[PDB]
Structures are given as structure tokens and as C-alpha cells.
Amino acid sequence: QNRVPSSRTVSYFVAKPSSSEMEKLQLGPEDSILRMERIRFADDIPICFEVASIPYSLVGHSNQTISAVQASEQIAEYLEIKRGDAILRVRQVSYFENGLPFEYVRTQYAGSRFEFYLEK
Amino acid sequence: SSRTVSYFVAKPSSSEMEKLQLGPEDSILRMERIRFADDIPICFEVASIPYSLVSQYGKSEITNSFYKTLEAKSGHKIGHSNQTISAVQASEQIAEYLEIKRGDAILRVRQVSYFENGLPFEYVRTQYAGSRFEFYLE
Amino acid sequence: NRVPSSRTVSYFVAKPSSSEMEKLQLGPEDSILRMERIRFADDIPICFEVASIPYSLVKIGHSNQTISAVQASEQIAEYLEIKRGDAILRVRQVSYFENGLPFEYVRTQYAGSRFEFYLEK
Amino acid sequence: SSRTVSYFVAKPSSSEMEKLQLGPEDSILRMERIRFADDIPICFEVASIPYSLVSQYGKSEITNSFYKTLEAKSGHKIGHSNQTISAVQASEQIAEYLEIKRGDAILRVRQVSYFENGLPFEYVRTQYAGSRFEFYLEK
Ligand SMILES: [Mg+2]
Ligand SMILES: [Mg+2]
Ligand SMILES: [Mg+2]
Numbered sequence: 001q002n003r004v005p006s007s008r009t010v011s012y013f014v015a016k017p018s019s020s021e022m023e024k025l026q027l028g029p030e031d032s033i034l035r036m037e038r039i040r041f042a043d044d045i046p047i048c049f050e051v052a053s054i055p056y057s058l059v060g061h062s063n064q065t066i067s068a069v070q071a072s073e074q075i076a077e078y079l080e081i082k083r084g085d086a087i088l089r090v091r092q093v094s095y096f097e098n099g100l101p102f103e104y105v106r107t108q109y110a111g112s113r114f115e116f117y118l119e120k
Numbered sequence: 121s122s123r124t125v126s127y128f129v130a131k132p133s134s135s136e137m138e139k140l141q142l143g144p145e146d147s148i149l150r151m152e153r154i155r156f157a158d159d160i161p162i163c164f165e166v167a168s169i170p171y172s173l174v175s176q177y178g179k180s181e182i183t184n185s186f187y188k189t190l191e192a193k194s195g196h197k198i199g200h201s202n203q204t205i206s207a208v209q210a211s212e213q214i215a216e217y218l219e220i221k222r223g224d225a226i227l228r229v230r231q232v233s234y235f236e237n238g239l240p241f242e243y244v245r246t247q248y249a250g251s252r253f254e255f256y257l258e
Numbered sequence: 259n260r261v262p263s264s265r266t267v268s269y270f271v272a273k274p275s276s277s278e279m280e281k282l283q284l285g286p287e288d289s290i291l292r293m294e295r296i297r298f299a300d301d302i303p304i305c306f307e308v309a310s311i312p313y314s315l316v317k318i319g320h321s322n323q324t325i326s327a328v329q330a331s332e333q334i335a336e337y338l339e340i341k342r343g344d345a346i347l348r349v350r351q352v353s354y355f356e357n358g359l360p361f362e363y364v365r366t367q368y369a370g371s372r373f374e375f376y377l378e379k
Numbered sequence: 380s381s382r383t384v385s386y387f388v389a390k391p392s393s394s395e396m397e398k399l400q401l402g403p404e405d406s407i408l409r410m411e412r413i414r415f416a417d418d419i420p421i422c423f424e425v426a427s428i429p430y431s432l433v434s435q436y437g438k439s440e441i442t443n444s445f446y447k448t449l450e451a452k453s454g455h456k457i458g459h460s461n462q463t464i465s466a467v468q469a470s471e472q473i474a475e476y477l478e479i480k481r482g483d484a485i486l487r488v489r490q491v492s493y494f495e496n497g498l499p500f501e502y503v504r505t506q507y508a509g510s511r512f513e514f515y516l517e518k
Binding site (some may be wrong): 265342345350373376 | 448
């Protein structure tokens with residue numbers, strides 16, 4: 001494609017986790033996480049919305065899953081698509097050797113257009 | 121647990137011609153099926169297989185042990201496959217089958233699998249309920 | 259079209275380097291939070307990305323970018339599967355709040371030497 | 380300051396034919412140039428211009444006032460341009476010119492520029508000392 005990539009960090013805060021975050025980061029409701037949200041562009045076209053959580057306390061392997069979600073109002077807006085549009089989402093969790101999770105990243109793609117292609 | 125919505129022989133669409141390396145008059149077996157987990161639909165799946173590969177087989181061996189039947193008896197062995205993954209909204213038809221609302225997020229997987237000599241033997245197109253599924257990457 | 263994936267290589271609070279001081283407008287005692295990732299596409303390294311935020315920072319636009327070219331250090335040659343000394347594109351981005359206060363400095367460095375960008379005017 | 384290292388008319392090479400959209404036998408002006416900041420060389424540029432657009436200008440105009448001169452005179456407007464940015468190691472030659480070492484990191488920009496009417500007028504290939512330069516993306 002050859003385009004110049006860029007990003008905007010949309011939020012960066014410390015917070016108590018969601019259920020998903022509890023599940024994937026093996027945490028309790030009281031355990032703080034540090035959370036980054038970032039739009040990535042390829043030449044000023046938005047390409048994905050990316051949310052990364054690490055457990056605050058932290059101030060191996062990793063594994064990914066793919067799914068489809070609906071465009072929320074806010075994400076629709078960041079990615080310049082419409083609420084309701086179907087969107088690929090990639091969840092990644094990384095772990096230290098103990099199997100202690102340390103990062104949970106969730107990427108959503110601007111469309112509804114994007115495809116991934118795999119070979120076995 | 122799975123349910124077979126349909127199972128006929130038919131002439132291919134152009135997609136089917138194209139992914140199966142077939143001319144317009146070669147027949148396909150076309151098979152449609154829903155699969156359930158805890159009695160909730162997980163995925164709807166249309167498979168087309170060139171009929172010439174499969175016309176001498178038993179409906180249940182096509183249906184439950186396709187790959188093993190082909191290895192077993194075709195005298196060819198299974199080679200590469202490719203998958204194309206995308207997100208799409210549920211049509212009413214799919215929302216019907218999968219028991220969700222029209223417009224709900226579908227994870228769509230399209231796949232073509234070849235024999236080791238390069239012969240396409242199936243084109244399978246699967247629609248998963250987004251909220252109920254996760255595709256685990258190797 | 260290839261499935262992307264990343265590996266955080268380090269993540270720590272630290273006292274800033276000279277360019278961090280310069281781009282984030284900090285002094286040597288000011289701490290930053292510094293993350294370093296390798297981004298892959300189908301398990302081919304694509305870029306190495308370092309990003310640094312003022313640690314104190316726990317209303318945006320604008321930001322601006324710069325390109326240049328750097329030699330692959332040994333650390334980086336390894337991370338991106340290329341040779342020490344190869345010439346690689348490096349992009350720098352600093353993002354600011356409306357007031358002008360810099361709040362993030364990211365440096366992306368590309369695998370090869372082979373990579374190109376294309377602009378139009 | 381800037382220094383013209385060479386300056387002469389040539390029949391175009393293949394890449395020059397292709398980018399400037401010229402047949403073999405259409406002359407081009409080919410000029411090579413080093414620019415300095417604070418007496419340290421920042422960059423080396425090769426520029427090729429169709430000779431027919433430029434026959435009538437004099438060297439100074441071409442070397443220092445190219446864009447100005449072109450628009451003041453040619454009865455054409457400077458239209459689109461495009462650029463391809465890559466990273467390359469310094470050759471022995473470019474090292475000598477830029478006063479750096481073989482191997483050192485070069486930011487390379489190749490550019491074609493066009494008139495508002497679609498005609499190429501410039502194929503410019505610039506090699507910047509990585510460590511001494513930054514290219515600013517247009518806001
Ligand atoms: Mg089809
Ligand atoms: Mg730096
Ligand atoms: Mg050339």
C-alpha cells in the first residue's frame with residue numbers, strides 16, 4: 001500500500017477493569033489497570049481502533065482470537081463508519097512464562113471491507 | 121449436535137466455478153448445516169464439493185467424516201487450504217437460522233481446500249454468530 | 259489482509275533521554291512511561307515502535323511527524339530480522355494538547371530497507 | 380549555500396524517459412548539487428529537466444530560481460508532485476560528497492513534478508544525510 005502511518009492516543013488513564021479485562025488479565029475488580037486507546041491511520045484514513053490494557057501493578061507466549069462486533073457510536077465516529085456496521089475485532093493476550101497475563105489488546109477495524117487471509 | 125438445512129446436487133454459481141476450478145455444467149453437491157453449542161446455534165455453513173469427487177459416497181460419510189472418507193478412499197491426499205475471514209451483518213435468513221437479530225455481527229469464514237495435487241475439493245462458507253464465537257489463531 | 263499482532267518488549271518508568279526531554283519538554287528528573295513493541299503482520303516483523311508519555315500525565319490534536327533514516331542497531335536488527343547497519347526508515351511523532359503541551363513521543367523504525375512511502379501534492 | 384557539482388545536457392536514461400515521459404533523443408538538463416547548513420552538507424540532489432522547457436533560461440535561473448522562473452516565464456502552472464521516500468546506505472561517492480562514511484544512513488527522496496496540464500517537468504532524486512536531516516510531513 002506504501003502509505004504513511006500515524007496515530008492519535010484518544011485516552012490514557014488508570015482504572016478498575018471491565019469484566020473482560022478481569023477475565024483476560026486474571027484480575028479482581030479492585031486491581032487497577034493502565035489503559036491506552038489509540039486510533040491508527042494509514043495516510044489519514046482511519047484503519048483501526050486499538051485498546052491496550054496492562055495491570056498497573058506491572059509499573060513468554062501470547063495468543064489471538066478473531067471475532068465480529070457491531071460498530072458502537074463512539075467507534076463508528078473514530079473510524080468514520082456508521083453505528084451498527086459489522087467490524088472485525090482481534091483480541092490478543094500476552095503472558096510471561098509463569099502464564100501471568102500482562103497485556104490485553106483489542107483491535108477493531110474500520111469496516112466492513114477489511115478481510116484477513118490465511119493459509120494452512 | 122448439528123442440523124442439516126439442505127443437501128442437493130446443482131450446477132455451480134460462478135463463485136463456485138471459480139474456487140472449485142469447474143466449468144458451468146459440472147455439478148456440485150451443496151450442503152447446508154447449522155451447528156449448536158449448549159443447544160444454541162453457533163454457525164451456519166454452506167459447503168460445495170464437486171460432485172464427480174463424491175457421487176459414489178454415502179450421505180453420512182460426506183456429512184460426518186468427509187476428510188477421513190477422502191483420505192480413506194479418494195486416492196488423493198489433502199493439501200493446502202486458504203481461509204478468508206471477514207465481518208458482515210446478519211441477513212434475516214441467517215438471523216433466522218442462527219436465532220439472532222437481523223443486522224447482528226457475523227464472523228464470516230470462506231475457505232477453499234485443495235488436494236496435494238492442486239485439485240480444489242471444497243468451498244465452504246461459514247457464518248458464525250459474533251457474540252457467541254471466537255476464532256482461535258494457530 | 260495479513261493478521262497483525264504485536265509483542266511488547268519492554269514497558270517501564272524511567273528518566274528521559276535527551277530526545278525525550280527535548281520532544282516532551284521535560285527535565286532530567288521528570289519520569290516517563292516508555293513502551294516498546296514489535297509489530298508483525300503474519301509473523302513478519304514490520305516495525306519497532308517506542309512510545310513515551312510523561313509519567314505525571316497519569317483534549318488533543320494536533321500532532322506532527324518527521325521521517326528520516328537510521329542504521330539498524332544490533333538490538334533492533336535482531337527484533338526486526340535484518341542486519342546491524344542496514345538503512346531503515348524512522349518516523350517520529352509528537353502529539354500535543356491544545357495548549358501546546360507535548361504528551362506523547364513515538365518513534366517507529368521499519369524492517370528494511372525495502373520499505374517505501376509514497377506522498378502526493 | 381549550495382554547490383553545483385555538475386551540469387550538462389544528455390539524452391535521457393530509461394528511468395528518465397519513463398518519469399519525464401520523453402522519448403530517447405529528447406534532451407534533458409541534468410544537474411547535481413550539494414546543499415549545506417552551517418557549512419555542513421545536508422544533501423545531494425540529482426535533477427533532470429526536459430531540455431526543451433529550459434533552453435532559453437540561463438544557468439542561474441535554473442539553479443537558484445527554478446520554480447519562480449518557470450512560472451514567471453513558461454506560461455504554465457506548477458501542478459501536482461509525487462514523492463517516494465526510502466532509506467539507503469551511503470555509497471563511497473555520496474559519502475565523499477556529504478562528508479560521511481560509506482554505509483551511513485541516507486533518506487532518499489525521489490520526486491516527479493508536473494504542470495497543471497499533466498506534463499512532467501522535473502525528476503529529482505535527493506539523498507539526505509540521515510543524522511543531519513528530518514523530512515517534515517505536510518500538515
Ligand atoms: Mg459464494
Ligand atoms: Mg529517539
Ligand atoms: Mg534514476
